[PDB]
Amino acid sequence: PGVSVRDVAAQDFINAYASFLQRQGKLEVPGYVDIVKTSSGNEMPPQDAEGWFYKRAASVARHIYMRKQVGVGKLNKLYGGAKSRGVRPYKHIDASGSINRKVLQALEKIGIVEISPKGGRRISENGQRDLDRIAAQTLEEDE
Amino acid sequence: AQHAVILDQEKYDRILKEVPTYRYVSVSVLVDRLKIGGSLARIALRHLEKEGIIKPISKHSKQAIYTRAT
Amino acid sequence: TPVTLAKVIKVLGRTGSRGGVTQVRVEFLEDTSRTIVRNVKGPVRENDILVLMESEREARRLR
Amino acid sequence: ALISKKRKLVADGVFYAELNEFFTRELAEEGYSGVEVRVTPTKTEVIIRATRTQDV
Amino acid sequence: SLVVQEQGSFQHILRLLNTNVDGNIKIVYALTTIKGVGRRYSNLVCKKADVDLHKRAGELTQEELERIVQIMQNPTHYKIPAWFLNRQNDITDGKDYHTLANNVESKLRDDLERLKKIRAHRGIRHFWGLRVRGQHTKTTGRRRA
Amino acid sequence: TRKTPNGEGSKTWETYEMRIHKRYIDLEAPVQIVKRITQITIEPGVDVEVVVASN
Amino acid sequence: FTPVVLATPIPEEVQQAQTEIKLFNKWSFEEVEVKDASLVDYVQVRQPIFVAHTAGRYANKRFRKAQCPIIERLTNSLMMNGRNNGKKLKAVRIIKHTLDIINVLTDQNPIQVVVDAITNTGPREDTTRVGGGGAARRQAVDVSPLRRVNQAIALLTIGAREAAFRNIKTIAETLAEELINAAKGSSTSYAIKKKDELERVAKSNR
Amino acid sequence: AVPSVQTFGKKKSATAVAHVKAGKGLIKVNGSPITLVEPEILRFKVYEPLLLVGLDKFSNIDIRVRVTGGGHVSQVYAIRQAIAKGLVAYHQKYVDEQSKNELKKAFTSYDRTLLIADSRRPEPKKFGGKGARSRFQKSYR
Amino acid sequence: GRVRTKTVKRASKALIERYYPKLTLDFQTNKRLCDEIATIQSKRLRNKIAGYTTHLMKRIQKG
RNA sequence: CCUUAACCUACUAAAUAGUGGUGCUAGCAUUUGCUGGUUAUCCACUUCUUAGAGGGACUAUCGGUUUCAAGCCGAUGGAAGUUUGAGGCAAUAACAGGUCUGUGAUGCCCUUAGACGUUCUGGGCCGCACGCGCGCUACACUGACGGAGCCAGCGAGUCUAACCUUGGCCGAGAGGUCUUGGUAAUCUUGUGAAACUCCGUCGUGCUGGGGAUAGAGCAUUGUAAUUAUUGCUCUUCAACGAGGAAUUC
Ligand SMILES: [Mg+2]
Ligand SMILES: [Mg+2]
Ligand SMILES: [Mg+2]
Ligand SMILES: [Mg+2]
Ligand SMILES: [Mg+2]
Ligand SMILES: [Mg+2]
Ligand SMILES: [Mg+2]
Ligand SMILES: [Mg+2]
Ligand SMILES: [Mg+2]
Ligand SMILES: [Mg+2]
Ligand SMILES: [Mg+2]
Ligand SMILES: [Mg+2]
Ligand SMILES: [Mg+2]
Ligand SMILES: [Mg+2]
Ligand SMILES: [Mg+2]
Ligand SMILES: [Mg+2]
Ligand SMILES: [Mg+2]
Ligand SMILES: [Mg+2]
Ligand SMILES: [Mg+2]
Ligand SMILES: [Mg+2]
Ligand SMILES: [Mg+2]
Ligand SMILES: [Mg+2]
Ligand SMILES: [Mg+2]
Ligand SMILES: [Mg+2]
Ligand SMILES: [Mg+2]
Ligand SMILES: [Mg+2]
Ligand SMILES: [Mg+2]
Ligand SMILES: [Mg+2]
Ligand SMILES: [Mg+2]
Secondary structure (H helix, E strand, O other): OOOOOOOOOHHHHHHHHHHHHHHHOOOOOOOOOOOOOOOOOOOOOOOOOOOOHHHHHHHHHHHHHOOOOOOHHHHHHHOOOEEEEOOEEEEEOOOOHHHHHHHHHHHHHOOOEEOOOOOOOEEOHHHHHHHHHHHHHHHHHOO | OOOOOOOOHHHHHHHHHHOOOOOOEOHHHHHOOOOOOHHHHHHHHHHHOOOOOOOOOOOOOOOOOEOOOO | OOOEEEEEEEEEEEEOOOOOEEEEEEEEOOOOOOEEEEEEOOOOOOOOEEEEOOOOOOOOOOO | OOOOHHHHHHHHHHHHHHHHHHHHHHOHHHOEEEEEEEEOOOOEEEEEEEOOOOOO | OOOOOOOOOOOOOEEEOOEEEOOOOOHHHOHHHOOOOOHHHHHHHHHHHOOOOOOOOOOOOHHHHHHHHHHHOOOOOOOOOOOOOOEOOOOOOOOOEOOOOHHHHHHHHHHHHHHHHHOOHHHHHHHOOOOOOOOOOOOOOOOOO | OEOOOOOOOOOOEOOOOOOOOOOOOOOOOOHHHHHHHHHOOOOOOOOOOOOOOOO | OOOOOOOOOOOHHHHHHHHOOOOOOOOOOOOOOOOOOOOOOOOOOOOOOOOOOOOOOOOOOOOOOOOOOHHHHHHHHHOOOHHHOOOHHHHHHHHHHHHHHHHHOOOOOHHHHHHHHHHOOOOOOEEEEOOOOOOOOEEEEEOOHHHHHHHHHHHHHHHHHHHHOOOOOOHHHHHHHHHHHHHOOOOOOHHHHHHHHHHHHHHHOO | OOOEEEEEEEEOOEEEEEEEEEOOOOEEEOOEEOOOOOOOOOHHHHHHHHHHOOHHHHOOEEEEEEEEOOOHHHHHHHHHHHHHHHHHHHHHHOOOHHHHHHHHHHHHOOOOOOOOOOOOOOOOOOOOEOOOOOEOOOOOO | OOOOOHHHHHHHHHHHHHOOOOOOOOHHHHHHHHHHHOOOOOHHHHHHHHHHHHHHHHHHOOO
8 A cells, every 4th residue: 555654643653663673673872871860850660670761762763763764862851841840830841952962873884864954854865764664664663 | 668569379360260250450450359459450451461361552650450351 | 310301491580688588480291280489590591391399288488 | 133033123113213312302492393213325314303403 | 461460479568768668559650758869860770770760669679778768868879860859069079979768857957056056147047037039928828927 | 011110010021012014025027117116116114025046 | 225425425324324314323312212201301302413513502590401402411411520520521522432431231222221320320309408497407409300311321321331430331231330220120239229218318307 | 626615613823724625534633643643632513514514424525624823722623614604515516505504504503603603802901000991000009 | 782872873863864865774884884974083982883874774664 | 193902704925823635653543534754755725823914993883961062871783992902202491300330521629649440369248236118928728738630921142252052861850961953933932920729638737838947968050158149858837816006009
């Protein structure tokens, strides 16, 4: 029939790209993983421990696919949630541009995204290629 | 701290032999059978479904629901 | 336990010092041709159906 | 030069507010009655509308 | 995940670091009823300890428990960030410690003694038993002492 | 702004607005007509601006 | 049901039911009748709906409260106690879950058993605070159907809210618990009690 | 040049534009199918127009919709309005009138404001309160 | 409370007095009439002066 | 009357708004197809968006009720039928209401060089047994936490200057650093807001609800941060288990 990733529902795609980015083994996982907290506006680290770098890799990937070009900042603001300033009201806070900037470099190094012109990070022709592929792999699970 | 955070062999086979007649089974219904707290009662759900007994007729978080084997 | 259904026929006016009561003439459906006037609690329009819990008693003014 | 358009248009109104004052003091005994400011090439034109122009 | 079984392997309550630890809690949260061991410090240590966080404080090998202690009171050796730590840059030998169990109480006292003994207005302030951090005092805090 | 100079009263707030309307038209022409059409068509209070170029 | 497809495909039971019966989440609006005279015109049930969410202008006039699909009344009354003010997706989902629960217990269209629990907790007559002179006796009044519906819903939700507070059991379990008990009066539900009692003190001062 | 109409749907500030060309029958929103949509609980709110008039009706027509503005629920209503208003905008112009008027009939019959945009809008907040009616809090003395 | 001001009811007066041949139980033609016949300063007021002339008209006809 | 929020496939239009075609091009399917990219490669439009000019509603049609009066009520129609929603404006008169602490508006009085003038240094308005008010965060399971889904509108922004700030690296974080666009429907910005949705963890235990109080280290604004301007990490883990009489909206 043909396929995109937009044809695949947001979460089971991102679990799909996750289980597959894990299979692979290729990645680069800086090294401060597990010992880190994704946001100043966060309490506990993620519970994936050995992982989640894959999930946000999948998340980052898919999101870059859906559009022109996006940089580390827009990902901070995206991946940024609500911090309880404790007894003081909540305020939106951006999450860490380290987790993202190293994710974008690890997906660029594995050639699924590319330092787009104008600014940001365009999705790679080989990324297009392989996302739509595992997309199809994800629908084909459901046959 | 009021019991039901572990497995005690008799509790296993009690689960196995007590979940018919349960038209309603869920996190709250297993706790209510004076046993397993929400951590391991959710494991008892994922493993009673490993084969038999519970029919999954409800989806997700907080809420869950099963019935007896037909 | 003898229920006695009665359909509002006309709306009379609010009673009670507060003004939440509504006076109303009702014809009970099980054998019409006989009226009683009751005092309600909720909102009411014409042709509703009230469950008169006891059949023969009526009121008028409220304070 | 080089200002925002908003800031420019407000700034012009302050320019009006002050001018009207300076005349409303200065020309009291000449029956001053209001100004207008007209902008052109070459010049910047202010017209005193007062009821005794031989004393202005 | 999986219904487990075990035998009499797990003994509830187990004492470490001069404090006591309830069994039958998700271990990570058990090390926090020790002093100086928050939810993040506990987390990272067990992660670094090669332990199953899934597990309760119940199971756990003795060998594990001891590796847990080792990591807790020797952070910078087991390559823990040091900014992850409650007592950076001491103030005498200037090393970075993570003071734990009955000892945090000591240093809390130790520090305050320095302030008082130097006569600094934060000492004076702790001494009068007030709020130090500068918060207004007219209205807030009445029941108190 | 609050209506009162001072502080007493209910806290009546007012609100002032000035309306800035912008328009632009593009024309191709010689130099004579631009200069003819721009010195005249003068209007006090309206801001006329004439640039040039394709950058 | 004669399946059809085009490009973007429409799943099986989706295609199926929709074009066929115009039923709920996937429950039956046909059959289900308000087992009480009166209360009809004040319980909806037809036109059927899919889920309990509507850009409903049920407020701008006096009784257009009464045309509202009755399930969407229940759900609407779920989302309160401030922290849950708004949050209709929350309430609506709790209803679907709740309805899935009732149906497991004793079958019956669970939307029907909801029709029954609403009818079976409306106070046939209540009391009001008359003047009568300083010391104010209690006049027995006959409460409107519309008040009987409203009060049934307000009772049933609050009672289930009160039990859901501070225990493992989730809202929908106790809701469905409340409605199941209330369906055929058994005095074990907070609503059946409070109805039965308002009718005891309304009888005592007449 | 193929036959095609464009429409829109508006609840609160959410506007939803909808193109209705002649095709093999897609039903896509922004860029993803109408099987996704999620809200999900609300999903059958946007299926609704398809099912009130027959899924069949869409086999000669490709349908794309893109939504900007509003909020999560404010978009689910705007789209389904755009779809139904589109389905009758194609029968107004291409197929005959009787049929269109038989679609406005089983749409407005059951309804949910499918062809009729809701007029409800935010009220202004006024001074003295944190809402439009909600005044503050006085204590007298 | 949709009670017509005096300026409305009074204009409706002088119109129906002097332009009763012309005018008819139709607002829309009465409205346009009020353009070609009467000098009002606002659309809103004109439709008020009209839709009311239309009412009076509508009931001069049965007495 | 004005203003704003609602209705115009009618009018005038738009590379600072957008849409359809075409080129140039990516991917997935290949049988056409699906889903992106390309401030000008052109062609066409104006539904979406913008604001000019209009139109529109007059509680209209019909029916109830009313002295068959002004009006009220119900239905249908309708973008709209509570003064269409919400404001702006607003007579006569009154108070010893507030304001000499907004005014280089002012009478009168005080003071005027050992100053009640002005400025500089430092402290104070923050001082804490405690009464009163407005509030913020909470007591959790319609919940906290962690992944992930991911959606607004009113704004505002740098010249003789340092404002709004994308992107790239570095940094756990706060932040840093080299660059960048915008005097702005053009850049920040689609302000990828937050509740919220979803899949998990926890499981009623002052618990993983709550985050006061405090310790230690790191940064940012500024000449200056001690009595801790703010931000961050770790640790410390209070009271509060729904709140008397009362009382706001
Ligand atoms: Mg977000
Ligand atoms: Mg998030
Ligand atoms: Mg601790
Ligand atoms: Mg508001
Ligand atoms: Mg072909
Ligand atoms: Mg082809
Ligand atoms: Mg237009
Ligand atoms: Mg209507
Ligand atoms: Mg108006
Ligand atoms: Mg006085
Ligand atoms: Mg003054
Ligand atoms: Mg003076
Ligand atoms: Mg001042
Ligand atoms: Mg003055
Ligand atoms: Mg002085
Ligand atoms: Mg002060
Ligand atoms: Mg006071
Ligand atoms: Mg106040
Ligand atoms: Mg969450
Ligand atoms: Mg915007
Ligand atoms: Mg560092
Ligand atoms: Mg520059
Ligand atoms: Mg407690
Ligand atoms: Mg605690
Ligand atoms: Mg917390
Ligand atoms: Mg200081
Ligand atoms: Mg001080
Ligand atoms: Mg300050
Ligand atoms: Mg309370």
